[PDB]
């Protein structure tokens, strides 16, 4: 909530993956001076000789950028008494550690988790290519300023795409394929050669999610499992 005469102001906090698993949970003690959010669209416009054609491909990657200053006067902390310079240095060190460890293409763990404690909204975010720009000019000598730009991956309400547990009814790991392969490994080279011959003969004679119940996709697996317990030719078929 913002200061609206009904509730007191609340200020932004950022959750980071802890390198031992779990998290760190940093928070700002003075809120941003500028706050900007962009929502670009992938729409494109092409002009044909007799008509205009409007084509859209959906939402594009959002950008979050904000700028602010760390407070001067000392302020108590939930486990210390930390000054503005220590807070800014802690921020720089978190950011440096998060950027440097990403040298394997992408962290297998968390993106940064962002809580907008001011206007109700939550995002998962990544460091933008502008990065953490820190400056301190002649004006306001004892106040630090920080500029952060981020890109939004998705809402924090939704879990990871690949991690979603699919239906997986029936059996995704059928035993028929496994024991067929074991049988065929156990066969003699001449046996497999004759099986290849029979397959080629059948192919000549062509012309001229899995569930044992209410499903036909696994029909071949039951038939392929046969022709080895029963000698349907010196070797299986298909």
């Amino acid at each position: 909530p913002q200061s609206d005469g009904i509730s007191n102001l609340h200020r932004i906090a950022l959750r980071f993956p802890k390198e031992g698993g779990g998290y760190d949970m940093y928070r700002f003690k003075v809120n941003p001076e500028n706050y900007t959010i962009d929502s670009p669209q992938r729409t494109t416009a092409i002009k044909t000789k007799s008509d205009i054609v409007i084509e859209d491909y959906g939402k594009d990657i959002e950008v979050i950028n904000f700028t602010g200053t760390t407070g001067f006067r000392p302020v108590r902390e939930a486990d210390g008494l930390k000054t503005g310079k220590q807070k800014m240095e802690e921020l720089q060190s978190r950011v440096s550690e998060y950027a440097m460890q990403g040298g394997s293409g992408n962290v297998s763990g968390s993106y940064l988790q962002f809580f907008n404690f001011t206007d109700d909204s939550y995002y998962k975010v990544h460091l933008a290519p502008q990065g953490l720009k820190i400056t301190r000019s002649k004006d306001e000598p004892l106040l630090f300023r920080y500029e952060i730009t981020l890109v939004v991956i998705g809402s924090l309400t939704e879990a990871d795409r690949s991690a979603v547990t699919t239906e997986e009814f029936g059996n995704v790991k059928p035993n028929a394929s496994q024991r067929v392969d074991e049988g065929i490994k156990e066969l003699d080279k001449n046996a497999r050669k004759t099986r290849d011959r029979n397959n080629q003969e059948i192919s000549r004679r062509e012309n001229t999610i899995y569930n044992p119940r209410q499903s036909t996709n696994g029909l071949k697996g039951n038939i392929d499992n046969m022709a080895l317990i029963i000698g349907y030719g010196d070797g299986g078929v298909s």
Binding site: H10, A13, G22, R27, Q113, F115, F117, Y122, L156, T157, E158, A159, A163, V164, T165, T166, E167, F169, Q214, T216
Partner: protein, 212 residues
């Protein structure tokens, strides 16, 4: 997958097919999906008495396929079996382990909680459809993330979250609940309706879009 429909007064059979597919001509497929005889719909309910299973009337329920499974004979066959029970094919059937909701709700995150039980006599209690979905959200969320002895990243971080009662921490509990619940494909999405921080009691209530 499918949609339900309720037959209305003097409802034209072709109007159903048009109303949900735009063309009229797919009504031949729809009536085959629902195992109807030629009298597809009838005003009088006494006429249904003669052939109840093969004759529908006002206020009866019909099954509408989605467009892709329209001409699949196998879907037509299965959709001729699961009439007004088709939900069971998507949500599934599983064993009941919630023997008393009066028990585990007062003990919460711990070892040695849930157990198999028996409804009726002799047949072990199998809990099905929406009632399977209740269990498969509840039993998931009570498990801590690391727990289960195959396929880790089950469960939730909920047991970590008993920190200070201050507002940020409450939103952190909302986030882990949302994260845990949207993790199963059977639910489209989730969002918070309301929350209430008592002196040491968190209370909050959440919507989930179960499919069908």
């Amino acid at each position: 997958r499918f949609k339900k429909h309720v037959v209305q007064h003097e409802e034209t059979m072709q109007a159903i097919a048009q109303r949900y597919y735009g063309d009229v001509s797919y009504w031949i497929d729809l009536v085959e999906h629902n195992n109807l005889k030629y009298p597809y719909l009838v005003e009088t309910d006494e006429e249904k008495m003669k052939d109840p299973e093969r004759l529908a009337s006002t206020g009866d329920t019909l099954i509408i396929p989605i467009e892709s499974d329209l001409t699949d004979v196998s879907a037509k066959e299965i959709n001729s079996r699961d009439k007004d029970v088709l939900v069971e094919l998507a949500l599934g059937r599983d064993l009941n382990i919630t023997a008393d909701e009066k028990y585990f709700n007062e003990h919460g995150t711990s070892d040695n909680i849930l157990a198999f039980s028996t409804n009726g006599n002799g047949d072990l209690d199998t809990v099905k459809g929406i009632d399977n979905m209740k269990q498969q959200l509840q039993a998931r969320l009570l498990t801590p993330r690391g727990s289960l002895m195959l396929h880790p990243n089950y469960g939730s971080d909920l047991h970590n979250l008993f920190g200070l009662n201050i507002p940020e921490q409450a939103t952190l509990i909302e986030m882990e609940v949302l994260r845990t619940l949207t993790s199963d494909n059977r639910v489209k999405s989730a969002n918070l309706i309301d929350w209430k921080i008592q002196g040491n009691v968190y209370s909050g209530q959440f919507s989930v879009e179960i499919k069908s």
